[PDB]
Amino acid sequence: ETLGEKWKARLNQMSALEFYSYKKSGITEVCREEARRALKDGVATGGHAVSRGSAKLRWLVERGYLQPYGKVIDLGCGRGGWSYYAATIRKVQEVKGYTKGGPGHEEPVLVQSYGWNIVRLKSGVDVFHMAAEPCDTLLCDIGESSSSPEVEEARTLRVLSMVGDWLEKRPGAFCIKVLCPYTSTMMETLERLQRRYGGGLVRVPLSRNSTHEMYWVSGAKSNTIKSVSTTSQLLLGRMDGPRRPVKYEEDVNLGSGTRAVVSCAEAPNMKIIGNRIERIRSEHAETWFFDENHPYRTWAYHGSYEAPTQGSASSLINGVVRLLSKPWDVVTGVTGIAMTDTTPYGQQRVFKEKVDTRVPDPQEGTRQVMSMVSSWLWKELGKHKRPRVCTKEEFINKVRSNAALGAIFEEEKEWKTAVEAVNDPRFWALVDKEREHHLRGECQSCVYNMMGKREKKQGEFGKAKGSRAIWYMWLGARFLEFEALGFLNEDHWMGRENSGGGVEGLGLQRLGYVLEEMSRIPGGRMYADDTAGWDTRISRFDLENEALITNQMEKGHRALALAIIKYTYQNKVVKVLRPAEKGKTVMDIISRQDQRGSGQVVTYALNTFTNLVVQLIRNMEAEEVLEMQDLWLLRRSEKVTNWLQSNGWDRLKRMAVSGDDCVVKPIDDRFAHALRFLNDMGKVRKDTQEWKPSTGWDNWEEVPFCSHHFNKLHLKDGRSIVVPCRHQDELIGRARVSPGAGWSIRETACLAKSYAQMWQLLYFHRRDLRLMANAICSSVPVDWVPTGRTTWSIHGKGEWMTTEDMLVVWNRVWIEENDHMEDKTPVTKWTDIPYLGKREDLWCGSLIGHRPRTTWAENIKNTVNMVRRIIGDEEKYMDYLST
């Protein structure tokens, strides 16, 4: 009927050679060879266009049909070349990109093109079910070419029926793909929408001649039929006669590096940290400079200089575990697990979103409630115990050789390992120097080093996930910390003994008993909700409440303590890695006055403390003691301590608090919706709607705490034991990974054994974990020593790191030292110990009953013998498998 529809009919009529002739005939294209090589490798610093679309947006804006600015939203970012070109534009200030990804379709690619620091991308989003947000510039490249116009219409109509919802929130500029603009209903609807919102339709000559695709843009204005018939006419004419010459152009070069951004950070207290700053400058005045392109909004930028790049993302596999776990090759939750990206790139692309936040400054009423609760808790904790100056002797008592230097200055660059330094009086001479400066009120050396952590974590986009930041200080400063405050860890101030709610020291064996005991106490449901990125949410006021313990010290101890707190905690100076433009890599120095780092000596202590403060506050709001205006200012202060000294311990012993994570059993269900003080402090609940009621639980076995939910089991004779559990796939994945680069197969086998005896010790109740662990200890020589680290949890002491037999260690930890089990009879054989319930083992990730696990289970000894052969025969193996 129409000039377009006939062209489509003809296009379908054709054959393959005519297809080829027409498709490329006489359009413009870009030199994409450079780019496709850079994509083959993934050279982020090249600064090349990740897709074709970057040119399409370039043409649209440089010709002047689009006026992009401010907050930009890319719908269907795909690779993200639209977003990546957006980043470059002078007036843009934030780029959000949404797409689907998953099986078959494109996932977002990550590069270091100019302004990448404002690019937040996400996948797994069927934007139809996503709500609208107020963008300044709206982009949508969502089309889906097909043969029949029947579908082109329907799909473009679905697209528009979606994007209207967004458009009615008045974007300053917009560009949306319109696949099918050539039919009756389409011309109609496009005319109506052009009337009701403006804009105009433009055809890009870069696009292939095989579709009628057009773009709907803000800056232009034109009648629909007129442009549609221009495109239809030219498309038709191009068909017959000569195959007209293609036009070559060069692809846009995006540049590289970061972009200048809103600097809304708090100004620094120059005389606390100035000594450290100007020391660093005096050291590196060779190449010292101030980069104008900084991606940091909340940190005070103090300068940068050239440095060498650190870490990598490469991830090695432990063939022992893998070849023993062939049937798990299909599950994504296992194969997708890999290393964390600890390059400056991978550090920063987590930093800029997770770490670069500034918390809502809580109101004076919540401020006063926090200081009150913290004062009461400092009183009640320091009743039995009292502080003390910790000694050099105890420091070297604790120390072992595998800790980190923190090599910052020249004077500290002598040693290589800890046990070497600790026995050299030069070290302690410098410690005494920094101490006698601290007592005078000047900080010279206590400076933070920072890099991303090496973790085994889920892969995102089918790629290495970004590394969360870890920052710690040089060892001497850690000694100052320890002598001042380390007594909190040493004397077990957070132990359940003294505290009641804390569990400082208790291993993963015992904690379930705490959960059951808590469950026997009557009340409402059990409520465990994880706080979103705890460390970054800590405010000045929380730190100043944690400094109140100094009330109970003596004057020397308080002098050193407050010195270290103020010049260290409440004013922090950091050295961080950033990747510069065109390859080179640099070090930046920044400061701030809130949050806490995971490399502080009393991280666990302080976190558990203020977390207890928060849980107390939430129980006060839940049980209606805190009224709704007391956020603003405190009415009847007294009635806080009236409650605390009536029920404070009574509620406290209904808590299990471990640093970041928490578990509570309140009196009634109102705790589920007493979120307002919780929100005011800035301690939001992770990835749940900020104001929605909390998901509680009834049966205590299904409570997750420190990534584990605990289950009770009766022995085959009669006694009862409590064991920790989690999802199998996580542990099999963790085992698969090899932390070290360039490691001989020996130490990878050592790791494999470490994991094996970890499973035997802890997750024996899992059929596949016991099976595979016995297979590992069998196929691995029982000679060799277990080395490496398994799961970073502090509640794993390291009890499986010895060639001792695991039956005896099992008896020791689960019976002989088992304080919650009276009957001391050590059971003599493995297969007496029961597995978990079949339905629950299936639920937590087991593959029992399925044919891969059957086939692999029957051929276990063939594979194990193959492992022995590949390692090297005539080494002392042992066949643990009996059954």
Ligand X SMILES: Nc1ncnc2c1ncn2[C@@H]1O[C@H](CSCC[C@H](N)C(=O)O)[C@@H](O)[C@H]1O
Candidate segments 211-219, 446-454, 660-668, 817-825, binder of Zn ion by CB under 5 A: 446-454
- Shortest Å distance, C-beta 607 to ligand X: 39
Among 49, 118, 320, 446, interactor with Zn ion by CB under 5 A: 446
- Shortest Å distance, C-beta 564 to Zn ion: 7
Q: Where is the chain broken, named by the residue before each break, C–N > 2.5 Å?
A: none
Tell me how far apart the alpha carbons of residues 61 and 139 are, in angstroms, rounded to a whole number.
Answer: 13
Q: By C-beta, is 446 or 749 nearer to Zn ion?
A: 446
Whether the CB-CB separation of 451 and 350 falls below 8 Å is answered with: no
Candidate segments 77-85, 491-499, 508-516, 550-558, binder of ligand X by CB under 6 A: 77-85
- Residues in contact with Zn ion, counted by CB under 5 A, come to a total of 4
- Shortest Å distance, C-beta 198 to ligand X: 23
Q: Any known ligand binding at 725?
A: yes
Which positions ≥6 away from 54 have C-beta within 8 Å? 81, 82, 84, 85, 251, 252, 254
82 binds, among ligand X, Zn ion, none (CB under 5 to 8 A by kind): ligand X
Phi, psi of 314 (to 5 degrees): -50, 140
Q: By C-beta, is 225 or 713 nearer to Zn ion?
A: 713
Instruction: Label the pairing between strands 708-714 and 720-725.
Output: antiparallel
Tell me how far apart the alpha carbons of residues 737 and 416 are, in angstroms, rounded to a whole number.
Answer: 27
- Shortest Å distance, C-beta 105 to ligand X: 3
Q: Any known ligand binding at 126?
A: yes
Taking CB under 6 A as the rule, does residue 77 contact ligand X?
Answer: yes
Taking CB under 6 A as the rule, does residue 82 contact ligand X?
Answer: yes
Taking CB under 5 A as the rule, does residue 508 contact Zn ion?
Answer: no
- Residues in contact with ligand X, counted by CB under 6 A, come to a total of 19
| Strands of 214-217's sheet in order across | 119-122, 92-98, 70-75, 137-140, 173-178, 214-217, 200-202
Q: Any known ligand binding at 446?
A: yes
- Shortest Å distance, C-beta 221 to ligand X: 24
Binding flags for Zn ion, 834-863, as an x/- string (CB under 5 A)? ----------x-------------------
Q: By C-beta, is 205 or 441 nearer to Zn ion?
A: 441
Q: By C-beta, is 44 or 771 nearer to Zn ion?
A: 771
Tell me how far apart the alpha carbons of residues 417 and 414 are, in angstroms, rounded to a whole number.
Answer: 10
Sign of the CA dihedral running 10, 15, 16, 18: negative
- Shortest Å distance, C-beta 434 to Zn ion: 5
Q: Any known ligand binding at 127?
A: yes
Whether the CB-CB separation of 464 and 509 falls below 8 Å is answered with: no
Q: Any known ligand binding at 438?
A: yes
* Amino acid residing at 726: R
Q: By C-beta, is 33 or 393 nearer to ligand X?
A: 33
561 binds, among Zn ion, ligand X, none (CB under 5 to 8 A by kind): none
Q: By C-beta, is 76 or 500 nearer to ligand X?
A: 76
Q: Any known ligand binding at 215?
A: yes
Taking CB under 6 A as the rule, does residue 214 contact ligand X?
Answer: no
> Read out DSSP for 312-335?
----EE-HHHHHHTGGGGS-HHHH
Q: Any known ligand binding at 419?
A: no
- Shortest Å distance, C-beta 435 to ligand X: 57
Q: By C-beta, is 175 or 408 nearer to ligand X?
A: 175
Under DSSP, is residue 813 helix (H, G, I), strand (E, B) or coil?
helix
Q: Any known ligand binding at 99?
A: yes
Q: By C-beta, is 62 or 627 nearer to ligand X?
A: 62
Taking CB under 5 A as the rule, does residue 725 contact Zn ion?
Answer: yes
Phi, psi of 668 (to 5 degrees): -150, 175
Query: DSSP character for 206?
Result: T
Q: By C-beta, is 77 or 750 nearer to ligand X?
A: 77
Up-side HSE of residue 501: CA atoms within 13 Å toward CB? 30
Q: By C-beta, is 53 or 200 nearer to ligand X?
A: 53
**Among the listed residues 543, 485, 514, the one whose alpha carbon sits nearest the alpha carbon of residue 658:** 514
77 binds, among Zn ion, ligand X, none (CB under 5 to 8 A by kind): ligand X
Tell me how far apart the alpha carbons of residues 153 and 159 are, in angstroms, rounded to a whole number.
Answer: 10
Query: Which residue has tokens 């009529």?
Result: 13
Taking CB under 6 A as the rule, does residue 100 contact ligand X?
Answer: yes
- Shortest Å distance, C-beta 138 to ligand X: 13
Tell me how far apart the alpha carbons of residues 355 and 471 are, in angstroms, rounded to a whole number.
Answer: 12
Tell me how far apart the alpha carbons of residues 722 and 96 are, in angstroms, rounded to a whole number.
Answer: 46
Q: Other CB atoms closer than 10 Å to residue 208's CB: what's the count?
A: 14
- Shortest Å distance, C-beta 706 to ligand X: 36
Phi, psi of 162 (to 5 degrees): -80, -55
Binding flags for ligand X, 8-47, as an x/- string (CB under 6 A)? ----------------------------------------
Q: By C-beta, is 86 or 761 nearer to ligand X?
A: 86
Taking CB under 5 A as the rule, does residue 515 contact Zn ion?
Answer: no
Candidate segments 59-67, 94-102, 504-512, 590-598, binder of ligand X by CB under 6 A: 94-102
> Read out DSSP for 584-651?
-EEEEEEEESS---TBSTTHHHHHHHHHHHHHHHHHHHHTT-S-TTTTTS-SSTHHHHHHHHHHHHHH
Tell me how far apart the alpha carbons of residues 188 and 366 are, in angstroms, rounded to a whole number.
Answer: 58
Among 25, 45, 88, 99, interactor with ligand X by CB under 6 A: 99
Taking CB under 6 A as the rule, does residue 105 contact ligand X?
Answer: yes
Region of residue 500 (phi > 0: left; psi between -120 and 50: alpha; otherwise: beta): left
Taking CB under 6 A as the rule, does residue 166 contact ligand X?
Answer: no
* Amino acid residing at 493: W
Which positions ≥6 away from 662 have C-beta within 8 Å? 528, 529, 530, 531, 611, 615, 655, 656
CA distances (Å), 427 to each of 283, 416, 420, in order? 20, 13, 10
Taking CB under 5 A as the rule, does residue 762 contact Zn ion?
Answer: no
Residues 414-453 that bind ligand X (CB under 6 A): none
- Shortest Å distance, C-beta 580 to Zn ion: 30
Candidate segments 13-21, 92-100, 258-266, 491-499, binder of ligand X by CB under 6 A: 92-100
Taking CB under 5 A as the rule, does residue 443 contact Zn ion?
Answer: yes
- Shortest Å distance, C-beta 160 to ligand X: 13
Which positions ≥6 away from 823 have C-beta within 8 Å? 719, 815
Q: Any known ligand binding at 264?
A: no
Among 76, 486, 659, 733, interactor with ligand X by CB under 6 A: 76
- Shortest Å distance, C-beta 167 to ligand X: 16
* Amino acid residing at 277: I
Tell me how far apart the alpha carbons of residues 477 and 474 are, in angstroms, rounded to a whole number.
Answer: 6
76 binds, among ligand X, Zn ion, none (CB under 5 to 8 A by kind): ligand X
Residues 123-152 that bind ligand X (CB under 6 A): 125-127, 141-142
Tokens matching residue 12: 């379908």
Whether the CB-CB separation of 460 and 435 falls below 8 Å is answered with: no
Residues making up the binding site for S-adenosyl-L-methionine: 51, 81-82, 99-100, 126-127, 215
Residues making up the binding site for Zn(2+): 434, 438, 443, 446, 709, 725, 844
Q: Which residues bind Zn ion (CB under 5 A)?
A: 443, 446, 725, 844
Residues making up the binding site: 51, 81-82, 99-100, 126-127, 215, 434, 438, 443, 446, 709, 725, 844
Q: Which residues bind ligand X (CB under 6 A)?
A: 51, 53, 76-82, 98-100, 105-106, 125-127, 141-142
